RNA sequence: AUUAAGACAUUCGUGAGUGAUUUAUUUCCAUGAAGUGGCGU
């Protein structure tokens, strides 16, 4: 009942600002992971968003999240939040509106993270993901690859990285892996996913401020594509079981929508938190 | 047995709030639905 894995499914474009002064075209850059350079959410922003959703229940917030910043007495937080690392990203396609993109290195990182943290349902997922990765490496033979598993998606083109996907027939994708990584899943090489997720290929949006019809300002914003999947780990310390159960029920309720990041008033960063389903 | 032993620079903290890729710009300028009759001396 500890250190379980939660999956974040974005319902809209997400912008979590990095706060670094970029003097190039994109003034507002999104938050990226320190080691893998993949888009991510810091555990600080995740905790802030989840606290903002739960702020109505004062006792639950005090028990699980800690104390208010201007409370006279300080109370340490009992639940440990972890940074949300990117799992799947949507990529444009011709046969289907989009494909779910994941790389072999992303799968390796996920397997290693699950092994280190020992999630609640980690064993079966680790075994099956290792089998899938071994089959993928056997079929690829060290070459660049783009593998889809639905036979109808053969020859689907990734628009940014103009590579058509091939279907390895003997590599099976289990339904639980489909639920986790997403439907219409394409597994690419590390270089293809790095090119897809870099600053030049992530969606960049142009915005302006108008004063009586004439443009006062202009800036470029980059965002995480809608339907992107991110995963984070949640460890509960010496937290009370009743408050933990309330938190997990509310967080994983299908009617619960959490806003993470910037631009809340223009519908940015709205997502659903799902728990790791038993295999 | 020695101005000694014990002590995490830690707790709480969303890079967030406001922002229309908009304003100005004629698919327009030139151009003949015209030219010629023929044979029967």
How does this structure look, described?
This is part of a larger assembly, with one chain. Strands 1, 3, 4, 5, 6, 7, 10, 13, 14 and 15 form a ten-stranded mixed β-sheet that branches. This protein has a three-stranded mixed β-sheet with strand order 2-12-11, with no helix packed on it. The protein has helices at residues 43-54, 58-64, 104-117, 122-140, 175-181, 190-197, 241-251, and strands at residues 4-10, 26-28, 40-41, 79-81, 84-92, 98-103, 146-148, 157-158, 163-164, 185-188, 204-211, 214-222, 229-236, 258-259, 270-275. The protein is built from seven helices and 15 strands. It is of the alpha+beta class and 279 residues long. It binds one RNA strand of 41 nucleotides through helix 1, strand 11 and strand 12. Keywords: Antiviral defense. Pfam families: RAMPs (PF03787). This is Type III-B CRISPR module RAMP protein Cmr4. InterPro entries: CRISPR-assoc_RAMP_Cmr4, RAMP_III_fam. Residues 8-271 form the CRISPR type III-associated protein domain.
* Strand residues, percent: 25-35%
Number of helical runs? 7
Distance between the termini: 16 Å
Shape: globular
What is the total tally of β strands?
A: 15
User: Can you give the helix content as a percent range?
Assistant: 25-40%
Order of helices and strands: EEEHHEEEHHEEEHEHEEEHEE
Task: Indicate the structural class.
Answer: alpha+beta
- Largest beta sheet, briefly? 10 strands, mixed
Instruction: Kindly provide the radius of gyration, computed on alpha-carbon positions and rounded to a whole number of angstroms.
Output: 20 Å
